[PDB]
Design an enzyme around this catalytic site. Structure first.
Site, PDB file in Angstrom:
ATOM      1  N   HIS A  98       0.838  -1.228   0.000  1.00 26.31           N
ATOM      2  CA  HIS A  98       0.000   0.000   0.000  1.00 26.31           C
ATOM      3  C   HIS A  98       0.860   1.259   0.000  1.00 26.31           C
ATOM      4  CE1 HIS A  98      -3.232  -2.769   1.429  1.00 26.31           C
ATOM      5  NE2 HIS A  98      -3.880  -2.063   0.522  1.00 26.31           N
TER       6      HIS A  98
ATOM      7  N   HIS B 186       1.685   1.582  -5.732  1.00 25.10           N
ATOM      8  CA  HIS B 186       0.262   1.179  -5.758  1.00 25.10           C
ATOM      9  C   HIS B 186      -0.619   2.363  -6.168  1.00 25.10           C
ATOM     10  CE1 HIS B 186      -3.483  -0.716  -4.578  1.00 25.10           C
ATOM     11  NE2 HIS B 186      -3.730   0.310  -3.780  1.00 25.10           N
TER      12      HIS B 186
ATOM     13  N   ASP C   8      -5.101   5.731  -0.846  1.00 24.51           N
ATOM     14  CA  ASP C   8      -4.469   4.986   0.282  1.00 24.51           C
ATOM     15  C   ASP C   8      -3.435   5.867   1.010  1.00 24.51           C
ATOM     16  OD1 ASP C   8      -5.836   2.572   0.437  1.00 24.51           O
ATOM     17  OD2 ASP C   8      -4.480   1.523  -0.920  1.00 24.51           O
TER      18      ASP C   8
ATOM     19  N   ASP D 197      -8.478  -0.711  -7.843  1.00 24.66           N
ATOM     20  CA  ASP D 197      -7.759  -1.098  -6.617  1.00 24.66           C
ATOM     21  C   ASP D 197      -7.273  -2.537  -6.759  1.00 24.66           C
ATOM     22  OD1 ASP D 197      -6.584  -0.379  -4.172  1.00 24.66           O
ATOM     23  OD2 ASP D 197      -8.330  -0.976  -3.040  1.00 24.66           O
TER      24      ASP D 197
ATOM     25  N   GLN E  96      -5.843 -17.823  -3.124  1.00 26.12           N
ATOM     26  CA  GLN E  96      -6.035 -16.961  -4.317  1.00 26.12           C
ATOM     27  C   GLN E  96      -7.278 -17.418  -5.089  1.00 26.12           C
ATOM     28  OE1 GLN E  96      -4.193 -14.037  -5.567  1.00 26.12           O
ATOM     29  NE2 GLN E  96      -4.031 -14.223  -3.331  1.00 26.12           N
TER      30      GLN E  96
HETATM   31  C1  LIG Z   1      -7.353  -6.733   0.992  1.00 25.24           C
HETATM   32  N1  LIG Z   1      -6.630  -6.916  -0.294  1.00 25.24           N
HETATM   33  C2  LIG Z   1      -5.646  -5.929  -0.764  1.00 25.24           C
HETATM   34  C3  LIG Z   1      -6.872  -8.016  -1.050  1.00 25.24           C
HETATM   35  O1  LIG Z   1      -7.665  -8.868  -0.686  1.00 25.24           O
HETATM   36  C4  LIG Z   1      -6.213  -8.252  -2.342  1.00 25.24           C
HETATM   37  C5  LIG Z   1      -6.028  -7.268  -3.310  1.00 25.24           C
HETATM   38  N2  LIG Z   1      -5.427  -7.871  -4.318  1.00 25.24           N
HETATM   39  N3  LIG Z   1      -5.250  -9.230  -4.085  1.00 25.24           N
HETATM   40  C6  LIG Z   1      -4.648 -10.171  -5.027  1.00 25.24           C
HETATM   41  C7  LIG Z   1      -5.738  -9.497  -2.848  1.00 25.24           C
HETATM   42  C8  LIG Z   1      -5.757 -10.808  -2.167  1.00 25.24           C
HETATM   43  O2  LIG Z   1      -4.898 -11.641  -2.323  1.00 25.24           O
HETATM   44  N4  LIG Z   1      -6.763 -11.118  -1.358  1.00 25.24           N
HETATM   45  C9  LIG Z   1      -6.898 -12.357  -0.630  1.00 25.24           C
HETATM   46  C10 LIG Z   1      -8.205 -12.653  -0.094  1.00 25.24           C
HETATM   47  C11 LIG Z   1      -8.457 -13.803   0.648  1.00 25.24           C
HETATM   48  C12 LIG Z   1      -7.377 -14.659   0.864  1.00 25.24           C
HETATM   49  N5  LIG Z   1      -7.265 -15.844   1.581  1.00 25.24           N
HETATM   50  C13 LIG Z   1      -5.954 -16.228   1.516  1.00 25.24           C
HETATM   51  C14 LIG Z   1      -5.448 -17.449   2.147  1.00 25.24           C
HETATM   52  C15 LIG Z   1      -6.335 -18.342   2.731  1.00 25.24           C
HETATM   53  C16 LIG Z   1      -5.815 -19.485   3.297  1.00 25.24           C
HETATM   54  C17 LIG Z   1      -4.458 -19.778   3.310  1.00 25.24           C
HETATM   55  C18 LIG Z   1      -3.592 -18.865   2.767  1.00 25.24           C
HETATM   56  C19 LIG Z   1      -4.105 -17.717   2.176  1.00 25.24           C
HETATM   57  N6  LIG Z   1      -5.269 -15.408   0.774  1.00 25.24           N
HETATM   58  C20 LIG Z   1      -6.063 -14.375   0.364  1.00 25.24           C
HETATM   59  C21 LIG Z   1      -5.801 -13.202  -0.380  1.00 25.24           C
HETATM   60 MG   LIG Z   2      -7.128   1.006   0.803  1.00 23.96          MG
HETATM   61 ZN   LIG Z   3      -5.453   0.549  -2.645  1.00 26.26          ZN
END
Ligand SMILES: CN(C)C(=O)c1cnn(C)c1C(=O)Nc1ccc2[nH]c(-c3ccccc3)nc2c1
Ligand SMILES: [Mg+2]
Ligand SMILES: [Zn+2]
Length: 313
Positions: A68, A72, A107, A217, A269
């Site tokens: 962030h 970004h 942000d 975003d 993911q």
């Molecule tokens: C807040 N934010 C910025 C984002 O959510 C965001 C923005 N871009 N990308 C690519 C993401 C992202 O990766 N989100 C995400 C959501 C739920 C998940 N559960 C997991 C996960 C679960 C179990 C084990 C390991 C891992 N990994 C996760 C990653």
């Molecule tokens: Mg934000």
């Molecule tokens: Zn952002």
């Protein structure tokens, strides 16, 4: 007033595509941003001396966190620029001004922690704003930098237009609260399939701009796979720092934020592409058809994450 910015040939061509990466040269990002404001809004809409001073105070108020950060901010401005340029006629002269600034500031002052962690830590900001905690802080920091001397990029607007453009920026920055996205997209899905979506309903533009803000975003998911892969390392680096701070408060963090569950990343993911990203760019492409390349690129990366699980990388 004849000081057109130009970009080297490859940048000048690749910057027009949704999947552009702004590269590793921090000192070019401001020129990149100005070039997009000029081509997106006109060379007349902002005073260059005031703009550059605004850009550099904004950069100074982003922090040295793995995700962030200033890169970004500019990545999210560039995605928004791609949307505006492939939907040339759908947007007012003000919206084009407001939304690129919104994205650069969305942000401001982020420290790499979720709203959830501010609540559990009991941060002062959680006392001052009970919902969208960081996002009300980001907007508050935007207004501050605007009220510094020589920083009012909107000086030449009427009192009226000034209030309209701060209201576009405010709602735009709030909508980056992913907790709000779910309801916002559900409502837009229903308005579009029961034909009621009308872009003269100011109530409906707001929602649509809110979905563009989620789209921009999340746009690391819409890049070429090696940019998507390498940005995920940064995102998790924040996530796992926050979980470390969680365990410090005496609280088991969610798995997303548990570095001890690295192993399940790819599976996590999938969840996120299936539950958030794919539905996001789907609904957006329905409302704004020329944004299709964002959907296409999202599907490719979802497919690349399926390959990781199946031991083919
Ligand atoms: C807040 N934010 C910025 C984002 O959510 C965001 C923005 N871009 N990308 C690519 C993401 C992202 O990766 N989100 C995400 C959501 C739920 C998940 N559960 C997991 C996960 C679960 C179990 C084990 C390991 C891992 N990994 C996760 C990653
Ligand atoms: Mg934000
Ligand atoms: Zn952002």
């Amino acid at each position: 007033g004849l000081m057109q910015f130009t970009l080297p040939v490859r940048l000048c061509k690749e910057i027009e595509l949704f999947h552009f990466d702004i590269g590793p040269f921090e000192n070019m990002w401001p020129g990149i941003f100005v070039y997009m404001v000029h081509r997106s809004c006109g060379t007349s809409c902002f005073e260059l001396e005031k703009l550059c001073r605004f850009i550099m105070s904004v950069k100074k108020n982003y922090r040295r966190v793995p995700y962030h950060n200033w890169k970004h901010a500019v990545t999210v401005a560039h995605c928004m620029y791609a949307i505006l340029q492939n939907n040339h006629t759908l947007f007012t002269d003000l919206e084009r001004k407001g939304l690129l600034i919104a994205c650069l500031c969305h942000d401001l002052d982020h420290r790499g922690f979720s709203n959830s962690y501010l609540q559990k830590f009991d941060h002062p900001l959680a006392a001052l704003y009970s919902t969208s905690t960081m996002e009300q802080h980001h907007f508050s920091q935007t207004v501050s930098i605007l009220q510094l001397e020589g920083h009012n990029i909107f000086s030449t607007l009427s009192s009226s237009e000034y209030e309209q453009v701060l209201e576009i920026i405010r709602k735009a920055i709030i909508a980056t609260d992913l907790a709000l996205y779910f309801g916002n997209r559900k409502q837009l899905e229903e308005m579009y399939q029961t034909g009621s979506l009308n872009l003269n309903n100011q109530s409906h533009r707001d929602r649509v701009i809110g979905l563009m803000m989620t789209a921009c975003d999340l746009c690391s998911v819409t890049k070429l796979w090696p940019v998507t892969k390498l940005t995920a390392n940064d995102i998790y680096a924040e996530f796992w720092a926050e979980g470390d701070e969680m365990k410090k408060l005496g609280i088991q963090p969610i798995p997303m934020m548990d570095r001890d569950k690295k192993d399940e990343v790819p599976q996590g993911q999938l969840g996120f592409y299936n539950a958030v990203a794919i539905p996001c760019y789907t609904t957006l492409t329905q409302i704004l058809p020329p944004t299709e390349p964002l959907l296409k690129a999202c599907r490719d990366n979802l497919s690349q994450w399926e390959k990781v699980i199946r031991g083919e990388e």
